[PDB]
Amino acid sequence: YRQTYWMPEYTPLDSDILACFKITPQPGVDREEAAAAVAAESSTGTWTTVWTDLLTDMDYYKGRAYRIEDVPGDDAAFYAFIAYPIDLFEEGSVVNVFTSLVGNVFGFKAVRGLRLEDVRFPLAYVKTCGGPPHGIQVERDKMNKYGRPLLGCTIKPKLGLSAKNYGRAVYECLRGGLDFTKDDENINSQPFMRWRDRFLFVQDATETAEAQTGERKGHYLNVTAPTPEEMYKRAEFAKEIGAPIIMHDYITGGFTANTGLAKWCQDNGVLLHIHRAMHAVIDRNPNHGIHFRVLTKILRLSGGDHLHTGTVVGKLEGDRASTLGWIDLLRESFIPEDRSRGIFFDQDWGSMPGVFAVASGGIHVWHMPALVNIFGDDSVLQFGGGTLGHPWGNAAGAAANRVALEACVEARNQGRDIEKEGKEILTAAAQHSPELKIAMETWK
Amino acid sequence: YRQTYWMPEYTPLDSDILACFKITPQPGVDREEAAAAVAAESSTGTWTTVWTDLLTDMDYYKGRAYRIEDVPGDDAAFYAFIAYPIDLFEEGSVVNVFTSLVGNVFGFKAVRGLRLEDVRFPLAYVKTCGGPPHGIQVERDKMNKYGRPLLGCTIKPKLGLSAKNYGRAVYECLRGGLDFTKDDENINSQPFMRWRDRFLFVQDATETAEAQTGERKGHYLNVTAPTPEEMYKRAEFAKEIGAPIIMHDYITGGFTANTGLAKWCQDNGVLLHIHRAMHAVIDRNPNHGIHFRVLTKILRLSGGDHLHTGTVVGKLEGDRASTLGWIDLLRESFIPEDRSRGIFFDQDWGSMPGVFAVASGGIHVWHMPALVNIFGDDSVLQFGGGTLGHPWGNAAGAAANRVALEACVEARNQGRDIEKEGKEILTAAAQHSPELKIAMETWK
Amino acid sequence: YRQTYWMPEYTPLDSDILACFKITPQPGVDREEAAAAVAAESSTGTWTTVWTDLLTDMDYYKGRAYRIEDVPGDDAAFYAFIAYPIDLFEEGSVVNVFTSLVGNVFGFKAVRGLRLEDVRFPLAYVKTCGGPPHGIQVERDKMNKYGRPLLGCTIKPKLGLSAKNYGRAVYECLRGGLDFTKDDENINSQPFMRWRDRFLFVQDATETAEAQTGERKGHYLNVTAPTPEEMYKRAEFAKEIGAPIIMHDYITGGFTANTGLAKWCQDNGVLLHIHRAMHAVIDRNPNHGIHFRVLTKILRLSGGDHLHTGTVVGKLEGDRASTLGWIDLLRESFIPEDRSRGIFFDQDWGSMPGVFAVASGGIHVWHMPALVNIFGDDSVLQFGGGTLGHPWGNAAGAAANRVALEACVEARNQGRDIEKEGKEILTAAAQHSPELKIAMETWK
Amino acid sequence: YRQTYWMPEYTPLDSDILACFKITPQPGVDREEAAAAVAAESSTGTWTTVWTDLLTDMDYYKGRAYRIEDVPGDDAAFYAFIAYPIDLFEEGSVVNVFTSLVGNVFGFKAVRGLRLEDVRFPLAYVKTCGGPPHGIQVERDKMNKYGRPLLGCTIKPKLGLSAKNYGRAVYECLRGGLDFTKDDENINSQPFMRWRDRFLFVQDATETAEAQTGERKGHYLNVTAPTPEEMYKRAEFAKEIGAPIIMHDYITGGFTANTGLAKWCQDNGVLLHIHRAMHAVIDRNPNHGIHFRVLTKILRLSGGDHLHTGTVVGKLEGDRASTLGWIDLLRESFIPEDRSRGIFFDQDWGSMPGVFAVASGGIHVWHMPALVNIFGDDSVLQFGGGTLGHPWGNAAGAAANRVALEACVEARNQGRDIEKEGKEILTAAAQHSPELKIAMETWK
Amino acid sequence: EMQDYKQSLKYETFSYLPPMNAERIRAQIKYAIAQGWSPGIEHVEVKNSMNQYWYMWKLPFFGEQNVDNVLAEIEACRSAYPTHQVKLVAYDNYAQSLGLAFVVYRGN
Numbered sequence A, B, C, D: 001y002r003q004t005y006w007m008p009e010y011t012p013l014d015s016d017i018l019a020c021f022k023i024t025p026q027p028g029v030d031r032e033e034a035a036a037a038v039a040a041e042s043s044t045g046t047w048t049t050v051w052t053d054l055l056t057d058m059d060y061y062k063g064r065a066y067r068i069e070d071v072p073g074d075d076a077a078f079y080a081f082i083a084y085p086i087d088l089f090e091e092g093s094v095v096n097v098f099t100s101l102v103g104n105v106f107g108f109k110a111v112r113g114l115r116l117e118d119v120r121f122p123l124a125y126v127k128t129c130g131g132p133p134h135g136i137q138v139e140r141d142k143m144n145k146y147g148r149p150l151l152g153c154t155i156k157p158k159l160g161l162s163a164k165n166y167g168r169a170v171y172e173c174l175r176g177g178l179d180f181t182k183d184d185e186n187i188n189s190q191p192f193m194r195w196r197d198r199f200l201f202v203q204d205a206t207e208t209a210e211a212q213t214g215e216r217k218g219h220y221l222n223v224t225a226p227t228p229e230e231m232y233k234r235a236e237f238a239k240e241i242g243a244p245i246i247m248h249d250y251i252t253g254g255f256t257a258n259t260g261l262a263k264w265c266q267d268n269g270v271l272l273h274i275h276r277a278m279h280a281v282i283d284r285n286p287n288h289g290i291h292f293r294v295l296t297k298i299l300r301l302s303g304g305d306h307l308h309t310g311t312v313v314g315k316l317e318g319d320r321a322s323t324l325g326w327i328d329l330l331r332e333s334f335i336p337e338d339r340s341r342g343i344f345f346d347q348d349w350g351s352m353p354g355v356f357a358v359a360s361g362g363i364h365v366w367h368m369p370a371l372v373n374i375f376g377d378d379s380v381l382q383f384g385g386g387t388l389g390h391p392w393g394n395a396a397g398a399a400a401n402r403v404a405l406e407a408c409v410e411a412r413n414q415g416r417d418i419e420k421e422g423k424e425i426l427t428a429a430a431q432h433s434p435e436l437k438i439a440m441e442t443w444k
Numbered sequence E: 001e002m003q004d005y006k007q008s009l010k011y012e013t014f015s016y017l018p019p020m021n022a023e024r025i026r027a028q029i030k031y032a033i034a035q036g037w038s039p040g041i042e043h044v045e046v047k048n049s050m051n052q053y054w055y056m057w058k059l060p061f062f063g064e065q066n067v068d069n070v071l072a073e074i075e076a077c078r079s080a081y082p083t084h085q086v087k088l089v090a091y092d093n094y095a096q097s098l099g100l101a102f103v104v105y106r107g108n
Helices: A031-043 A094-102 A136-143 A163-176 A195-213 A228-241 A255-268 A279-283 A292-302 A321-331 A365-375 A394-413 A422-430 A434-443 B031-043 B094-102 B136-143 B163-176 B195-213 B228-241 B255-268 B279-283 B292-302 B321-331 B365-375 B394-413 B422-430 B434-443 C031-043 C094-102 C136-143 C163-176 C195-213 C228-241 C255-268 C279-283 C292-302 C321-331 C365-375 C394-413 C422-430 C434-443 D031-043 D094-102 D136-143 D163-176 D195-213 D228-241 D255-268 D279-283 D292-302 D321-331 D365-375 D394-413 D422-430 D434-443 E022-034 E067-080
Strands: A017-025 A064-071 A074-084 A111-120 A150-152 A180-182 A218-222 A245-249 A271-275 A306-308 A356-359 A379-382 B017-025 B064-071 B074-084 B111-120 B150-152 B180-182 B218-222 B245-249 B271-275 B306-308 B356-359 B379-382 C017-025 C064-071 C074-084 C111-120 C150-152 C180-182 C218-222 C245-249 C271-275 C306-308 C356-359 C379-382 D017-025 D064-071 D074-084 D111-120 D150-152 D180-182 D218-222 D245-249 D271-275 D306-308 D356-359 D379-382 E038-044 E085-092 E097-105
Touching: A017 A031, A031 A064, A031 A074, A031 A094, A031 A111, A094 A111, A094 A255, A094 A292, A111 A292, A150 A180, A150 A394, A163 A180, A163 A195, A163 A394, A163 C136, A195 A218, A195 A228, A228 A245, A228 A255, A228 B228, A228 B255, A245 A255, A255 A271, A255 A292, A255 B228, A255 B255, A279 A292, A279 B279, A292 A306, A292 A321, A321 A356, A356 A365, A365 A379, A365 A394, A365 A422, A365 A434, A394 A422, A394 A434, A422 A434, B017 B031, B031 B064, B031 B074, B031 B094, B031 B111, B094 B111, B094 B255, B094 B292, B111 B292, B136 D163, B136 D195, B150 B180, B150 B394, B163 B180, B163 B195, B163 B394, B195 B218, B195 B228, B228 B245, B228 B255, B245 B255, B255 B271, B255 B292, B279 B292, B292 B306, B292 B321, B321 B356, B356 B365, B365 B379, B365 B394, B365 B422, B365 B434, B394 B422, B394 B434, B422 B434, C017 C031, C031 C064, C031 C074, C031 C094, C031 C111, C094 C111, C094 C255, C094 C292, C111 C292, C150 C180, C150 C394, C163 C180, C163 C195, C163 C394, C195 C218, C195 C228, C228 C245, C228 C255, C228 D228, C228 D255, C245 C255, C255 C271, C255 C292, C255 D228, C255 D255, C279 C292, C279 D279, C292 C306, C292 C321, C321 C356, C356 C365, C365 C379, C365 C394, C365 C422, C365 C434, C394 C422, C394 C434, C422 C434, D017 D031, D031 D064, D031 D074, D031 D094, D031 D111, D094 D111, D094 D255, D094 D292, D111 D292, D136 E097, D150 D180, D150 D394, D163 D180, D163 D195, D163 D394, D195 D218, D195 D228, D228 D245, D228 D255, D245 D255, D255 D271, D255 D292, D279 D292, D292 D306, D292 D321, D321 D356, D356 D365, D365 D379, D365 D394, D365 D422, D365 D434, D394 D422, D394 D434, D394 E022, D422 D434, E022 E038, E022 E067, E022 E085, E022 E097, E038 E067, E067 E085, E067 E097
Parallel strands: A150 A379, A180 A218, A218 A245, A245 A271, A271 A306, A306 A356, A356 A379, B150 B379, B180 B218, B218 B245, B245 B271, B271 B306, B306 B356, B356 B379, C150 C379, C180 C218, C218 C245, C245 C271, C271 C306, C306 C356, C356 C379, D150 D379, D180 D218, D218 D245, D245 D271, D271 D306, D306 D356, D356 D379
Antiparallel strands: A017 A074, A017 A111, A064 A074, B017 B074, B017 B111, B064 B074, C017 C074, C017 C111, C064 C074, D017 D074, D017 D111, D064 D074, E038 E085, E085 E097
């Protein structure tokens, strides 16, 4: 098993697909043996040479482990680096690459746990996938929004609102100042609220808010459907009614469906918001699963204009590096290797446009200076509770959030340390914004 | 948080969706609090009552935890039973039910781990989904095969075979005696072997083997595609060329895509083989994930004629109950609650047809009496290594497997203890089968 | 015949379809024998066991009579209660359920008369059918009408009006104050008035009236056609021209056609008005036929936003209970058993939206307080004669009806006994409405 | 009311639609008044002249009662003859004519009962409808069957048979000698047996029987569906698999759906079998309903190649005239008025082809000479019990029925009184047919 | 005690009865002429018996009233084509169909 599928001397080609696996092996088993096992089961799946094996170029069509590294702070795990020829995969199929990498290796019985930490997509394979339909800069040009992060909100409760009541929440949220509102990952078409009525009333509310404000408005209309036919029908109806953006659940809906919807969005000029539902069943366990940075690479390969990445402020100061690293993976054109931030491979994206970063979950006006300092202008900040829980209503909460955002952006532009002076900046802004003042009073 | 979303007194309705969560909470947090937390985050996601909450029937549209049980042998975990009204979900959407159940609860920070153990699908919601396109009995009627388990084989290597060489492996495998051959989960359309050439040469080989043998033959042609349009095109081409069965990866491909393909298969009379790739990243961890029994329920709701369930013999004698329980979940019409086998809820399927059980991975002629005794006639046994590794070739290996299968089936029919007398039965069969004899000699 | 298809001890399952038949048997024949006869002929149709019978589960696939009750006041008839497994019917096919129930049993020669009184649709079968496209509340949200019953009018004469003249009746009727006008059940496309010209001129009149009044207007454009292709073409043209509501004859047109049109209406966001033409050939005879409550259940299962139910005031005070019972069946989510009102089974509808009640036929301003008190706000009151017979014209008649409606609604809201004080309330309203005053003078 | 809508002097035009109503009025009300009431409510529906009435030609657009006759043997009822201009109806719409005739008149409160006895379709309106897709002679030419009535059989039980078992009943029935087998009115697509599997296995059985016998075979595949889309899909699949005939339920399915299916059948060259399910709720009551002769006229106007008409032998000798009269209405080109046979109007059909008469229900080998003498060669005799109850099997029963049919046909051709000599003829035939002999022994 | 059905090829009307003799054929022809139908004679190969169009023997006997000549023509057809299936038909001009159609010799 050993000499056949792991080559210490092998130098990986620039077109090779590289994968890093954190192997937590059963005690007593050999590290090189386990590395070759992941390489084989992810490429060929067997060691016993059969007569059909001799009909192929065995030296070429196989994955090889070329480097084994210790895991800092974990003596029970080691890092296995495996190189895959670009010929092993369908061109432009995140589904096929993902299947080839994770089909059977996680069921290996000789390891206690297996984590896929990082995957290197070569520029040759990157150039084949469609990628994000529009990208950050094209979306900014279309929406006529520059110089500040975008604001979003999740309409709550997740259950019970009729089409008109959901629309009359969306309308106040948008007219208050948020650039976007968000359909929940649960809302596609329920008996209490059908999808067509959702789309119609949401478009009415968005148009009314845009007319009454003077700013481009949008709603991530959920098109996740039981069937691709239903999903395409819902997206086509959204385009027909004029919705500028839709939303898909790319994990639960599926990578094939997400890629098809992204291609349709690129074809039809419709922005695509991506929600990361279920990601926790996969990326939470530290010893078994596939990392959210790999999921982020897969999503940006498949196609999407927005992506949930976490609030960053929700973790301690010493646990932010991996989140920042996958943020850079999502947004930047070239991300150098960084072991501190969890970037195991140099990742060259070429001309593929970046994807907006979405921060959502338990964040309000107080986290906002930190959010601005961490994310920059190329991000979307979502305020579900921080907008709907406002005592004066959705419009007042949205106005408070927008005033805080503009004040923080101007403070950053003036050269101030917005995180150090956040309370002073917010108070100075609240001297001109009663809604903002009562917002801090509520959420202090 | 406590009194609002957990009701000890609540008696769950026969139409309610019930879910069982194994909660491994952070030490010191309350069990009822954690149960209500899973119930809330899986139904509404918040506790702070906003003004839009008062516009809805809060008593109805919420998930409630009604029972907490100790986990036998694990003092650090407890079982939370949650009831969901049928109104909370799209009718006939495994995607929507799955999203509502597992969207955010697994990212809960107050628990160390969360596992979805079992989910109760009421007959009312079951009657809405299409279910398996054909089912076990209809597939048996179509293929004219009765009284024995079906035989399959995975064509290996996963890489390198041209269309004609893959076909000339499939042809010998089928003409040797296997009812089916199997495309790998990696093979949909690669540069070394395109999907149309696959389908054409595979159909040629299948027709030749059927003509030369006198038995109906098939190949699970993989239609997993980057886009639903491509998947539908491949399935339509398979039907046009006359392929009786196709294969899909229902997890990596996606539940929406799998449901659409299952509906198409039911419409067009094409059998559907389902592969469970990636299932290990989800169901392996004992403290965090979603169980393969829940995945099996989801798959049979979505639609499929075959499903990989494990070889059963691959585990120790004391660890077979959960596998048998989800086997019964996949195949039987009504599965009573069984804590020993891991069946937490009474599961009534009504008239929905069963799904063939597929056993694959490291099994050969010696495991076969045990395989027959465990699975029964309504199963598919896959022999990749046990057929391709035969010294006399694929046809000889298939003949050996078929002779062993027929001998074991007849021995079971005669009333013998096939597991106790397996060696004697196989030797007696080998007295008339040199291929079988050399097969046992190879794999002893 | 006796022991085989009637089980006194059988307890019906919650998923079983239950039917109540009023059997008027030939004198001398056994009650249990006749009950088993209806059960058999509605499920299997024969008693002689043939060799193909032994190939099936005879204990399961059969309808069984489980209870026989006396008919109060009729010693010559008895009530037969029959339970049907949900497996006996196509899922979501009112056509199939109706055929299975009433195909041959009414031609039974051993009974003098057979009436189908009530049918229990279990929630499991209810969840499969599409149901009403929009429902009462969604229609109210779309039309922006709350707090009062809707007003309609049938354009008369049924014959002779050109497209423009029919439009110039509809325009005055709508601009007078009625929310809707109604195409007759006879008018789909006649030589004197073609359907396309109808739709165009009706849409012109509706738009003009809406612009001149400030209230949403509609016309139930009849799409009942000789062919489903023609019906779909007419409905599509109505949607293209912007008609918010169409009308179908669900009995003469057919249940299959009505279900298809209801599904199309739900898909395309078009309201559906249902007319009950021919219902009298079926539901009038007290000893032979199928009850209008069963027809109402069938219609709401098939799909429809409005339904004619009778004027209620047209019967004596002691004969209103059955009409009120089927009104509750049409509108309410759960209707408990009520023998006085003719509700023989507990009928759980779950989340299926209600259907507007339409009262039409010989009713004018004087019946109106009684109509309001009986029907409530969730009803449509139709005034054909009471609007067209107004001496000052259609607009004046519609204004009179609207003023009377608003006065009666306000009187009910103030807590007055509107039926006891109807004359005083109408006179007080007429002190400010000359059109209303002359309307009462005409119809006194 | 009187002078306006009933004209004793009016002579009805050859293009006028004439309807005969048996009115059982409330005691004391005027006969001419009731006749004018049916005429008005079936044409205009009102007597109060409104201002819109004066915009039309009231003398033309109205139905008029021109003759009142006593009912022989019933002093409490009288016959009302009403003439309708051809302009009152959509051209080629049995749905519209039926609605105009029976929409509201049966709910008239001044009559105790109303029966529509006969309706005169003028040749001008007849020439517009498509009529039967093929007709008796064209169907005979297509099936290559002449000189004898056709034989059919209903596959029983109605419940439980899988696709293959139903096919293995159909195969033996057809190979025994029956020209056709029949799907039940209940079987369109049930959970135990799906429609596509039905069509495939039925076509396989029909092809096998045709190959093994040398005679053209067919099965009335039921295409009655919840939606017209589903019905058209099933009919198209039947044509694609090569089924020569399909079946529809023209009352429960609907007249619009039946007309569309008949037009499709005429377009695609597929024979149409029509079942008359539910007809008893309408035509059984002697004082209230619409007659089966009117239903037969409506069906042949809509389109159909076969139609159930009753077994004729099932009634006493003195009650056969009405059945024979509607048989002549269905089959013959011109049926003169015959009060004894219930033909109230001269009915000219022109060139519209006749429809095969189907006799089914409780008939076996003994009724057969009478069946032949009554129906003639242009009829289909159905033997459900008389074929499936044969002790030697379906094939033997079919052979017995075919031998009896051929013997009776030859006896009629020889000039013998087949009804007088039926026992002798059947015994002489049984001297060469053991299956036939045991059939008479079973059913004596 | 039950007996199995022996399967064999069949030939439409009257094929389930014993083969007709001259008297029975004459009775059938008399029926055909009594109904006003025109007798006709057709023949085709045994393997081609299922053909919609058989070879036509001479022309249909319009206005023919002598069953003896009809039967003589049947026998002449048999003599001229001895391996051929032979069928007797009767044309119904008013209905544009065949009032009677059965085979006389079942081929060999």
